[PDB]
Design a protein around this motif. Structure first.
Motif, PDB file in Angstrom:
ATOM      1  N   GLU A 161      43.079  37.318  32.178  1.00  0.00           N
ATOM      2  CA  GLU A 161      42.192  37.360  32.893  1.00  0.00           C
ATOM      3  C   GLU A 161      40.727  37.425  32.317  1.00  0.00           C
ATOM      4  O   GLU A 161      41.027  37.228  31.200  1.00  0.00           O
ATOM      5  CB  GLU A 161      42.021  38.196  34.073  1.00  0.00           C
ATOM      6  N   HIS A 162      39.837  37.050  33.131  1.00  0.00           N
ATOM      7  CA  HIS A 162      38.454  37.018  32.682  1.00  0.00           C
ATOM      8  C   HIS A 162      37.479  37.720  33.553  1.00  0.00           C
ATOM      9  O   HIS A 162      37.427  37.636  34.781  1.00  0.00           O
ATOM     10  CB  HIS A 162      38.105  35.760  32.320  1.00  0.00           C
ATOM     11  N   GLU A 214      35.728  43.522  36.240  1.00  0.00           N
ATOM     12  CA  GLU A 214      36.232  44.232  37.119  1.00  0.00           C
ATOM     13  C   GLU A 214      37.774  44.320  36.978  1.00  0.00           C
ATOM     14  O   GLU A 214      38.683  45.275  37.012  1.00  0.00           O
ATOM     15  CB  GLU A 214      36.283  43.603  38.800  1.00  0.00           C
ATOM     16  N   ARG A 215      38.494  43.219  36.824  1.00  0.00           N
ATOM     17  CA  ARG A 215      39.929  43.062  36.294  1.00  0.00           C
ATOM     18  C   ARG A 215      39.915  43.575  34.864  1.00  0.00           C
ATOM     19  O   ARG A 215      40.979  44.516  34.503  1.00  0.00           O
ATOM     20  CB  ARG A 215      40.500  41.797  36.525  1.00  0.00           C
ATOM     21  N   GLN A 216      39.355  43.403  33.965  1.00  0.00           N
ATOM     22  CA  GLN A 216      39.128  43.913  32.712  1.00  0.00           C
ATOM     23  C   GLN A 216      39.356  45.451  32.515  1.00  0.00           C
ATOM     24  O   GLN A 216      40.313  45.851  32.060  1.00  0.00           O
ATOM     25  CB  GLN A 216      38.107  43.417  31.909  1.00  0.00           C
ATOM     26  N   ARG A 217      38.173  46.147  33.013  1.00  0.00           N
ATOM     27  CA  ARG A 217      38.349  47.644  32.977  1.00  0.00           C
ATOM     28  C   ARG A 217      39.733  47.943  33.772  1.00  0.00           C
ATOM     29  O   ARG A 217      40.165  48.877  33.206  1.00  0.00           O
ATOM     30  CB  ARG A 217      36.969  47.989  33.708  1.00  0.00           C
ATOM     31  N   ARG A 218      39.730  47.753  34.949  1.00  0.00           N
ATOM     32  CA  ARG A 218      40.867  48.078  35.611  1.00  0.00           C
ATOM     33  C   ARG A 218      42.253  47.984  34.987  1.00  0.00           C
ATOM     34  O   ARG A 218      43.115  48.818  35.118  1.00  0.00           O
ATOM     35  CB  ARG A 218      40.895  47.523  37.226  1.00  0.00           C
ATOM     36  N   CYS A 219      42.268  47.034  34.091  1.00  0.00           N
ATOM     37  CA  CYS A 219      43.410  46.573  33.423  1.00  0.00           C
ATOM     38  C   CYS A 219      43.606  47.660  32.284  1.00  0.00           C
ATOM     39  O   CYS A 219      44.685  48.101  32.092  1.00  0.00           O
ATOM     40  CB  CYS A 219      43.343  45.199  33.036  1.00  0.00           C
ATOM     41  N   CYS A 231      46.236  41.065  28.152  1.00  0.00           N
ATOM     42  CA  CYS A 231      45.379  41.050  29.523  1.00  0.00           C
ATOM     43  C   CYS A 231      44.030  40.503  29.148  1.00  0.00           C
ATOM     44  O   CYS A 231      43.312  39.520  30.103  1.00  0.00           O
ATOM     45  CB  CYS A 231      45.303  42.697  29.863  1.00  0.00           C
TER      46      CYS A 231
END
Length: 43
Positions: A18-19, A22-27, A14
């Motif tokens: 992505e980078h 928002e997506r990091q934490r949510r991931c 993961c």
């Protein structure tokens, strides 16, 4: 029982998938939810 690999594999996949934040934490939560659901067959 507790396939930590499935988890460590999601953090390394993961992170590169992505980078951002928002997506990091949510991931981190998504990959974790799957792990806990796996290690927990029935309680």
């Amino acid at each position: 029982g507790s396939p930590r690999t499935e988890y460590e594999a999601c953090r390394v996949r993961c992170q590169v998938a992505e980078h951002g934040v928002e997506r990091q934490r949510r991931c981190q939560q998504v990959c974790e939810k799957r792990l806990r659901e796996r290690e927990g067959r029935r309680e």
